Coordinates of C-alpha atoms and ligand atoms in Angstrom, one line a residue:
X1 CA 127.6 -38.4 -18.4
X2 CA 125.6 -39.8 -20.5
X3 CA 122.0 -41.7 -19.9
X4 CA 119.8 -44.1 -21.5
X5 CA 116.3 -44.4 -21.4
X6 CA 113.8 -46.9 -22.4
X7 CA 110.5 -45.6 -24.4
X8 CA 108.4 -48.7 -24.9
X9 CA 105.3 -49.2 -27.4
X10 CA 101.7 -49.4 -25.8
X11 CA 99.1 -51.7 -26.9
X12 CA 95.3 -51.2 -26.7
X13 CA 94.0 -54.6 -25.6
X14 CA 90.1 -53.2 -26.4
X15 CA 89.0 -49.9 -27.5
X16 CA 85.3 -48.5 -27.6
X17 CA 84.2 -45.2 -28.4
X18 CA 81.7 -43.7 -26.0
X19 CA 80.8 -40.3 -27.3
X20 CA 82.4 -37.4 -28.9
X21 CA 83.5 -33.9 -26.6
X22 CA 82.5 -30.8 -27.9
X23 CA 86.2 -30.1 -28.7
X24 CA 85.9 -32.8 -31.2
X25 CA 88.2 -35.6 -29.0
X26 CA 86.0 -39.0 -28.3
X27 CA 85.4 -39.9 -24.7
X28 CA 86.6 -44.0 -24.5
X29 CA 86.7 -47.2 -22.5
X30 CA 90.2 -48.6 -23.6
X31 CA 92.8 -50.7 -21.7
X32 CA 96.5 -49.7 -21.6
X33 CA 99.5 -52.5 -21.8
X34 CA 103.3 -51.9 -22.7
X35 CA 105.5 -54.2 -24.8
X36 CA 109.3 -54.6 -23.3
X37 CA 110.0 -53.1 -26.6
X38 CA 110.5 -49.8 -28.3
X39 CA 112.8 -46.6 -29.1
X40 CA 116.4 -45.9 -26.4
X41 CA 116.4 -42.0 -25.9
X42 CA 120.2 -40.7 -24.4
X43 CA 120.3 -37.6 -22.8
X44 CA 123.7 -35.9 -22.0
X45 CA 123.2 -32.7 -19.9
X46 CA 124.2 -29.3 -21.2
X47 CA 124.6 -26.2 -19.2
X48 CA 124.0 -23.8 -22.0
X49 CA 120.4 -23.6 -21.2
X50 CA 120.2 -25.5 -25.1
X51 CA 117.6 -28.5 -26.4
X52 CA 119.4 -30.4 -29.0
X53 CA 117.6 -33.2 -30.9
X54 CA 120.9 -34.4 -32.3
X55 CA 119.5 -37.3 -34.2
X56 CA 116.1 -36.6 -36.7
X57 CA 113.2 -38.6 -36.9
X58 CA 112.2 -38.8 -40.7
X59 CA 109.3 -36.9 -41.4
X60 CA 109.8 -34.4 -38.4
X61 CA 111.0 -31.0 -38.2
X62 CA 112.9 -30.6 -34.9
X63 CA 110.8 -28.0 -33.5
X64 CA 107.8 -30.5 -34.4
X65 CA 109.5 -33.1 -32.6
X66 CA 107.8 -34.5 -29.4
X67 CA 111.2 -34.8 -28.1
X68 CA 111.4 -31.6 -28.3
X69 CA 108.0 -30.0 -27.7
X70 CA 107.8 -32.1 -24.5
X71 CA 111.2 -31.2 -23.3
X72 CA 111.0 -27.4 -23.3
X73 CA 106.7 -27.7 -22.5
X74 CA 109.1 -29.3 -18.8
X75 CA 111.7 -26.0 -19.5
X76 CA 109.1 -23.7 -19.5
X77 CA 106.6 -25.4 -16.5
X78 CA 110.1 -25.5 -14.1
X79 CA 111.1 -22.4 -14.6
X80 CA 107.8 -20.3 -14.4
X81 CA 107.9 -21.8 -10.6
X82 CA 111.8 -21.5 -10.0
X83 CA 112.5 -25.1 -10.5
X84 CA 114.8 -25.1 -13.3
X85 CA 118.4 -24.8 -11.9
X86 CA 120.6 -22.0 -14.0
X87 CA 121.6 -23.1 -17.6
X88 CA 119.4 -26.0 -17.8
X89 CA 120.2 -27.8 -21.0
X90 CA 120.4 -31.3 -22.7
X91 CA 121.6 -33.0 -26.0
X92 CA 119.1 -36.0 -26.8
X93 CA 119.7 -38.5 -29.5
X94 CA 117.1 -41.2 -29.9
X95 CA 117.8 -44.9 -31.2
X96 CA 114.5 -45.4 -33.2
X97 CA 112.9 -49.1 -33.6
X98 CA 109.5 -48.2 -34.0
X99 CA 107.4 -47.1 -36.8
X100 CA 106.2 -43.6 -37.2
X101 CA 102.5 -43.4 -36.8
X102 CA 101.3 -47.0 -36.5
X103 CA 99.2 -47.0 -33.4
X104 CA 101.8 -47.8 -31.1
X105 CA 101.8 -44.5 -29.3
X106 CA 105.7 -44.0 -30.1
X107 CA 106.3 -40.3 -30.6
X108 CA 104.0 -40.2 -27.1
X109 CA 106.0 -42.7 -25.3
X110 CA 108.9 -40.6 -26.4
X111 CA 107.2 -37.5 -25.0
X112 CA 106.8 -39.3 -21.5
X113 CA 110.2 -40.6 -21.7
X114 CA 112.4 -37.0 -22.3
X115 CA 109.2 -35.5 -19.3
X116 CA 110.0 -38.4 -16.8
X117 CA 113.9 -38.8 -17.8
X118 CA 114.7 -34.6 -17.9
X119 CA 112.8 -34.3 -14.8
X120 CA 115.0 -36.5 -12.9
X121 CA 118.2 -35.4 -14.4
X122 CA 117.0 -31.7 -13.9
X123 CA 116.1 -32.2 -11.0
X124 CA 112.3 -30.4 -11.3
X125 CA 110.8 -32.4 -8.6
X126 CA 107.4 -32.6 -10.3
X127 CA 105.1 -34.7 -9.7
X128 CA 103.5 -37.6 -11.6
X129 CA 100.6 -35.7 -11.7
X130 CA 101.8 -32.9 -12.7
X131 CA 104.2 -34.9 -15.5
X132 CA 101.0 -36.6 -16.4
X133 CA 99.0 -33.4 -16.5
X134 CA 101.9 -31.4 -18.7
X135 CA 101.4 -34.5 -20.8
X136 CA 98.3 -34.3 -21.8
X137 CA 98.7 -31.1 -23.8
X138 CA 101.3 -32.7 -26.0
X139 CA 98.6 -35.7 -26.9
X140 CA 96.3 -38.3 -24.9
X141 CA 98.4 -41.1 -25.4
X142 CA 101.0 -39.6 -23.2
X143 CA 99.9 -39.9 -19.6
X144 CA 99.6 -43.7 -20.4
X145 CA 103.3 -43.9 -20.3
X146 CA 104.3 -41.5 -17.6
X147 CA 102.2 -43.1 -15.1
X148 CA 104.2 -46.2 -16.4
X149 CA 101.6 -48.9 -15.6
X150 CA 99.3 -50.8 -18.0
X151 CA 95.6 -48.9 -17.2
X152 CA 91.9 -49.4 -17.8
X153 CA 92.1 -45.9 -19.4
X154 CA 88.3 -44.1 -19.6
X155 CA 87.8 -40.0 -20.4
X156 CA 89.8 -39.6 -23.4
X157 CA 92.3 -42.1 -21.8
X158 CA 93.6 -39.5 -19.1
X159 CA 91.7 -41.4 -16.7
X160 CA 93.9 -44.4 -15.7
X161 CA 93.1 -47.1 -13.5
X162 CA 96.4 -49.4 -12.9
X163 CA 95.1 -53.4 -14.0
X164 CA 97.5 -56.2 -14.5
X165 CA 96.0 -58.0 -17.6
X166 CA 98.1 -61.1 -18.3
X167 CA 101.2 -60.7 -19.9
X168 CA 100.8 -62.2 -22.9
X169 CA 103.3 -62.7 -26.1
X170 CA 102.5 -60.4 -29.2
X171 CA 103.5 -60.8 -33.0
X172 CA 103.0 -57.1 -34.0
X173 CA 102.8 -56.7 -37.7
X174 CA 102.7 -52.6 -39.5
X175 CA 101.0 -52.6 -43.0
X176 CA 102.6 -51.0 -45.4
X177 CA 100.3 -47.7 -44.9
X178 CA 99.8 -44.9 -43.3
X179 CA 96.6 -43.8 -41.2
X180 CA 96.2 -40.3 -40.0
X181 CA 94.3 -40.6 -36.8
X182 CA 91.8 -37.9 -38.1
X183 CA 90.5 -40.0 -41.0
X184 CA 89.7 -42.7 -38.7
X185 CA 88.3 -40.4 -36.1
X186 CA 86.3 -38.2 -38.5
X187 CA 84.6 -41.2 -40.4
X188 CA 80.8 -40.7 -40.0
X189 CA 80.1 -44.7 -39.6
X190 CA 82.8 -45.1 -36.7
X191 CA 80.7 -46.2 -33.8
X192 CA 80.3 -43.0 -31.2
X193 CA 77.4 -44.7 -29.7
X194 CA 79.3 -47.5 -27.4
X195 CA 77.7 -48.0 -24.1
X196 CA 79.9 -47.1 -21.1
X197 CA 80.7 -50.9 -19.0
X198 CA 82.2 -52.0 -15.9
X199 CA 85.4 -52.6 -15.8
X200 CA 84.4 -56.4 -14.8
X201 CA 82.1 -56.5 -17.8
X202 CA 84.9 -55.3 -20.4
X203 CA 87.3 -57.7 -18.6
X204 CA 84.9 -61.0 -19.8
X205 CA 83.6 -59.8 -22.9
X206 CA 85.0 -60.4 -26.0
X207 CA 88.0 -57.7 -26.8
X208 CA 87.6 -55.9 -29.5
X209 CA 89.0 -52.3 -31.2
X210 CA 85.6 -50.1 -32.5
X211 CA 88.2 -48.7 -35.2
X212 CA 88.8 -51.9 -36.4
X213 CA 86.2 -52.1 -39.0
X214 CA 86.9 -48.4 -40.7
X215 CA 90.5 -49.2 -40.9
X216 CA 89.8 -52.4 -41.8
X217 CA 87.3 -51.5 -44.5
X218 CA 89.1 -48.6 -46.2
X219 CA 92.9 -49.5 -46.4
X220 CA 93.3 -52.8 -48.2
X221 CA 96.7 -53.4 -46.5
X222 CA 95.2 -53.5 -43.2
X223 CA 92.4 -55.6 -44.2
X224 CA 95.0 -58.2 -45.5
X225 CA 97.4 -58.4 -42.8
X226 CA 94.4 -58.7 -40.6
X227 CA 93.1 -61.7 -42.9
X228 CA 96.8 -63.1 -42.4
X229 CA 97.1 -63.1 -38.6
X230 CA 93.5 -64.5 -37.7
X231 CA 94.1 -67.7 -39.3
X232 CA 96.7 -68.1 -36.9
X233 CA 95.7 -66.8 -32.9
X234 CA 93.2 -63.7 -32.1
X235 CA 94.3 -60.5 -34.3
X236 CA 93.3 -56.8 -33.7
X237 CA 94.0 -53.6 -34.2
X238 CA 96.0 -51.2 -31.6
X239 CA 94.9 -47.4 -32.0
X240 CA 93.6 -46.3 -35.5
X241 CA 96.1 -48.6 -37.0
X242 CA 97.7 -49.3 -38.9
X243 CA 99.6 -51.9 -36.6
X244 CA 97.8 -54.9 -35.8
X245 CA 98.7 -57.7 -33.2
X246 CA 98.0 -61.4 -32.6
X247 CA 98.0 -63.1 -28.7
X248 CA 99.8 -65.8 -28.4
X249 CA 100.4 -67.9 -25.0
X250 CA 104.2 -68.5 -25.6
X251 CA 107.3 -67.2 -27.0
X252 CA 108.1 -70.1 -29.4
X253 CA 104.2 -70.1 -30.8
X254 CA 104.7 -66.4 -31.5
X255 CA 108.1 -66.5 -33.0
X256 CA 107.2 -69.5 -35.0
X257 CA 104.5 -67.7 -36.9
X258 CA 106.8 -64.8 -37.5
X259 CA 108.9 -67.0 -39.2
X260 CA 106.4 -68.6 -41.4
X261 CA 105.2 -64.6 -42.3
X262 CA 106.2 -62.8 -45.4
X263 CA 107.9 -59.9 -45.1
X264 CA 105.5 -57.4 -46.2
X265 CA 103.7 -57.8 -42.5
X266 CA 106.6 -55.7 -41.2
X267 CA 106.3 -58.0 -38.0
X268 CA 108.3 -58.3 -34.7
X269 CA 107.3 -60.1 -31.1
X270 CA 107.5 -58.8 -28.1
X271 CA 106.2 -59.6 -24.5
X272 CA 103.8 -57.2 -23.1
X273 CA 104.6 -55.8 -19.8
X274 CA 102.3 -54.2 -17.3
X275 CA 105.0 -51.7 -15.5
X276 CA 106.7 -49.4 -18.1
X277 CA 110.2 -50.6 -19.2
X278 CA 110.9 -46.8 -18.4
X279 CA 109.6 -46.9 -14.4
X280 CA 111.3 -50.6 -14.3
X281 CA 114.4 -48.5 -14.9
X282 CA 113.7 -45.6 -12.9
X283 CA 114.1 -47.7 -9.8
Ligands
LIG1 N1 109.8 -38.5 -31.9 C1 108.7 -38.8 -32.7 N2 108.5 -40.1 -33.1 C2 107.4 -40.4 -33.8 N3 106.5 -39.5 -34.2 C3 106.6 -38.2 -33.8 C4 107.7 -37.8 -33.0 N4 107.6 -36.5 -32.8 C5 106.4 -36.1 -33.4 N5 105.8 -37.1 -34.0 C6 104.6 -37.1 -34.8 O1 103.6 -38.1 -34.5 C7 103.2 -38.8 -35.6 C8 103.5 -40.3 -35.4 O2 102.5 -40.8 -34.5 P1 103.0 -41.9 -33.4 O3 102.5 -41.4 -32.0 O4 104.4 -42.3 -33.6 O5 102.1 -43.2 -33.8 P2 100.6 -43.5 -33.2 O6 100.3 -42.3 -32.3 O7 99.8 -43.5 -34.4 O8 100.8 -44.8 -32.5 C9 103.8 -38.1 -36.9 O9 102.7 -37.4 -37.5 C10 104.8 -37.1 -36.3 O10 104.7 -35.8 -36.9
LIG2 N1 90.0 -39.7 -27.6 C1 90.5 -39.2 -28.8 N2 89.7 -38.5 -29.7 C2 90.2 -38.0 -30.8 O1 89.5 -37.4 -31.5 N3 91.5 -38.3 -31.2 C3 92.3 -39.0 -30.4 C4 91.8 -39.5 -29.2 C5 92.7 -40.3 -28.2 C6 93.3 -40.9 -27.5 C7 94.1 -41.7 -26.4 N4 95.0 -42.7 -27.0 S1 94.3 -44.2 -27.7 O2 95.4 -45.1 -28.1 O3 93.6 -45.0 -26.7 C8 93.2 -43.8 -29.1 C9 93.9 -42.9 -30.2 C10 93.6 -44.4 -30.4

């Protein structure tokens, strides 16, 4: 048999950089929210004790592949505490709509798809904390999405508190460029200095993204489909770039705009969704 799984985009509603680790990560104050939108992973189970990433993602060598990495990081963790039933295997494909490296966290939601899909079809029995936990290794956007709800997210975003901000529409537009979280991360005027607020505090205030103005101010492309969007509703940017997004109340406000935009925004809409498409199909 053969399954499908959902691996939905994330959007960070705010972002603020607090500090820097001394393992060179930045400790944050960021809030998590999904969009019922994304990649479709299938998995058909092999008893060969084989990982197959039949379909490539451009740009990654299979063995690079978060698909892969977090499917036999779950391989090894199972069966270094006998939880891995004999032969273990899996062939995944993965139906790709999302853009590589744009700030929507995709190859991390795939991650916490193949841990959270393999670990039921495996039958592991792990836990969400222990998922979560296996997770982090592979990147910090990836506990987000196992946990599966939308998160004030504090630490290096590890630390999830479940919120339910309002569900709003998004026109999500990807420049034509791409950002290598380290640039952004390792640019000397990036605010680090951020002070740390209450959740009820962040939750009035005005949202903003403290990446924002390096991305904004050193790729051109950003900076213009950012100019583009703000005449229209409130426009940010999710991660390090290079997507940016624009809230809008309704569908038809949204969709009207993205109909009116040219086509070197690279935009779609989607509604955003505090429980993970993936946990809404778990049930
Ligand atoms: N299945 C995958 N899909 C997308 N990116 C992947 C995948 N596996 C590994 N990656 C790596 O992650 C990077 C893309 O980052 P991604 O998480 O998709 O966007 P962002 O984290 O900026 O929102 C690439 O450098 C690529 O090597
Ligand atoms: N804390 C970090 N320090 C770094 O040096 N690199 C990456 C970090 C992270 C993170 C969690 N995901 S995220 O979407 O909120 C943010 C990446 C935009």
């Amino acid at each position: 048999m053969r399954t499908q799984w959902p691996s939905p985009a994330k959007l960070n509603l705010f972002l603020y950089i607090t500090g820097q680790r001394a393992d060179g990560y930045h400790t944050l104050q960021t809030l998590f929210q999904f969009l019922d939108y994304g990649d479709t992973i299938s998995i058909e189970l092999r008893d060969d004790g084989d990982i197959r990433l039949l379909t490539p993602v451009e740009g990654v060598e299979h063995e690079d592949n978060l698909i892969v990495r977090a499917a036999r990081l779950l391989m090894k963790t199972a069966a270094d505490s006998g939880r891995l039933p004999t032969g273990s295997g899996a062939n995944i494909s993965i139906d790709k709509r999302l853009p590589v490296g744009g700030g929507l966290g995709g190859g991390s939601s795939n991650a916490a798809t193949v841990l959270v899909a393999l670990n039921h079809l495996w039958q592991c029995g792990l836990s969400m904390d222990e998922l979560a936990e296996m997770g982090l290794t592979l990147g910090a956007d990836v506990p987000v999405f196992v946990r599966g709800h939308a998160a004030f997210a504090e630490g290096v975003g590890e630390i999830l508190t479940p919120v339910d901000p309002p569900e709003k529409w998004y026109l999500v537009a990807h420049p034509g460029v791409s950002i290598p979280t380290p640039v952004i991360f390792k640019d000397p005027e990036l605010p680090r200095n951020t002070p740390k607020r209450s959740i009820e505090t962040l939750l009035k205030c005005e949202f903003s993204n403290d990446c924002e103005v390096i991305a904004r101010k050193r790729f051109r492309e950003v900076d213009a489909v950012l100019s583009w969007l703000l005449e229209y509703a409130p426009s940010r940017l999710t991660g390090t770039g290079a997507c940016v997004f624009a809230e809008f109340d309704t569908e038809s406000e949204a969709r009207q705009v993205l109909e009116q935009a040219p086509e070197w925004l690279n935009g779609f809409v989607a509604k955003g969704v505090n429980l993970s498409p993936l946990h809404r199909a778990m049930l």
